[PDB]
Amino acid sequence: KPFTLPILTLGELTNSRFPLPIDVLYTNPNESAIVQCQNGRCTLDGELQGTTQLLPTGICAFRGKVTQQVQDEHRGTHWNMTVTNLNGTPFDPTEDVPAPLGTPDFSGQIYGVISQRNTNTGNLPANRAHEAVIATYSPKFTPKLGNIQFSTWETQDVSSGQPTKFTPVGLASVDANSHFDQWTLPSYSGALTLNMNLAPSVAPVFPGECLLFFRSFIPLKGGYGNPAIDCLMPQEWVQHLYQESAPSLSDVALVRYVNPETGRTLFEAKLHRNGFLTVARNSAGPVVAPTNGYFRFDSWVNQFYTLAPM
Amino acid sequence: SKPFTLPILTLGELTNSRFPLPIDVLYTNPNESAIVQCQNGRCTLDGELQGTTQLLPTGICAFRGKVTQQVQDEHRGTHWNMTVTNLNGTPFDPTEDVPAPLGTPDFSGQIYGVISQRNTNTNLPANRAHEAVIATYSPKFTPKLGNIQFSTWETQDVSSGQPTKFTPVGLASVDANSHFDQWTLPSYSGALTLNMNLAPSVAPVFPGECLLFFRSFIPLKGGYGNPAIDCLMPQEWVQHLYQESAPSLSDVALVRYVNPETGRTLFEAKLHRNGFLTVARNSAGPVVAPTNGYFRFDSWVNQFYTLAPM
């Protein structure tokens, strides 16, 4: 079965690490951090890795039940919630995943909405929703143990023992104390514990090459900043690769970024077996190109192939 | 002739095309008196997008634009006038042959979500976000005219002339005065004006058949209720069909809902050319079936094909 990519343009793609549209292509050659995100991880022959699952609605989502309001040193009203798998089944910590699929894969204060639909009940359940923040760096962020903590501005109107959904919206803050670092993984089982079953780190191996990211700008609840989330492949590529399961005929696919209005190749890239892109670029920042561009699979090459400079 | 295919995503791997929600169940309602003419999640089998349908899961019921004016409500809450652009940021052209900007909500109700802003000017821009409600039945909901109104509990902290995003989360209410009706279209240009360029209504033509929906339950900000949103096809089908653009070889594709664990067919359905499903079922409610089940295209049939009763 021949390898293929979706023919979706950049303006028709969404981020695999946060529910956002892809805004720009982006490089940062001098990135010192180890790049090892856990969402949007999929091999070219369709093997999902890390915490990656298929739903755009599942990315950085949680499902579970509030247990109790809890004390926390930090501002706001805090709540413990047990988390299940996103499909409602119990999370089994013995499964070989880092955390429930969909769990956020970066450090920061993730802003969103907690909503509840009560179990009990014209035989219709009571509901409530409020803004909420999940600090993924918190010692109480233990999704691998089956529970996390969120904070609200709302002081009271959150119910214990009721089905609870977290819908992510953005970040609460990117100030110094909010610890936003998109390449720092949460400690999924809590402070001082080793993460396990991780998707592997990614890096360029060839000289002059750097990672190419699909970048989205993420909303902020307040403060100054223009934060972004970089994913290795968009969610639609994850969905496509997963379904096709085409054999990878080498370690590296040659892809061309093409303008379909002109038919011209804007640049070429290496699409690696583990599911990430590299380019021959010597600068950091956005790739300035029309958002009607798309990557076209041209052929299987090898690690020794030299890319045309961008 | 390029063969017609459906994605091999299971029910637990599909998302709603009319609101950013996972698919929860398949659902019928034979006695539905309303005309079914939703405008999101509309796509022909040969890949023609219709109504307000666009490809991004993040675009469904989303808005982008700028706030122009604050108006206080006579009783409670603050209202904000917003000019809307296309989701890709370009000016919305009301002379284009669409009902409204793509992604525009296609039902009557109070849609609850978060309005977020990132200022243009500054050396980092200021941000804010607040819970917001868009009443799509309001005389002020005129997205086809390039402007809508949203309300906030927040009384002051929304900025004029700054890039504004609406992230949908659920419904504010489903009480009588909140006018939720998933099959009542908004008046995209206001009450006395006719909606234009609509995707056509859908219905079974043969007796004993009824529409089959992909149903998702939608969160509530408050009050009692268990509201749901029914779409004709999941967003992943829209994306798939759009890319494949396989010729339709008849008016009806016969599809089988199959259990991959046993390989057995649970039921069959008609997938109609205009992009909707019917089944031979004489009852209302969910279809009790495993969520690892999926629809498999078997053959092109004819409108007179008699479905096996469910």
Ligand SMILES: C[C@@H]1O[C@H](O)[C@@H](O)[C@H](O)[C@@H]1O
């Ligand atoms: C930078 C400031 O952050 C705050 O949270 C906001 O409420 C203000 O409007 C402003 O954007």
Ligand SMILES: C[C@@H]1O[C@H](O)[C@@H](O)[C@H](O)[C@@H]1O
């Ligand atoms: C396949 C590779 O071709 C390169 O040119 C050589 O330098 C390597 O040793 C290797 O043989």
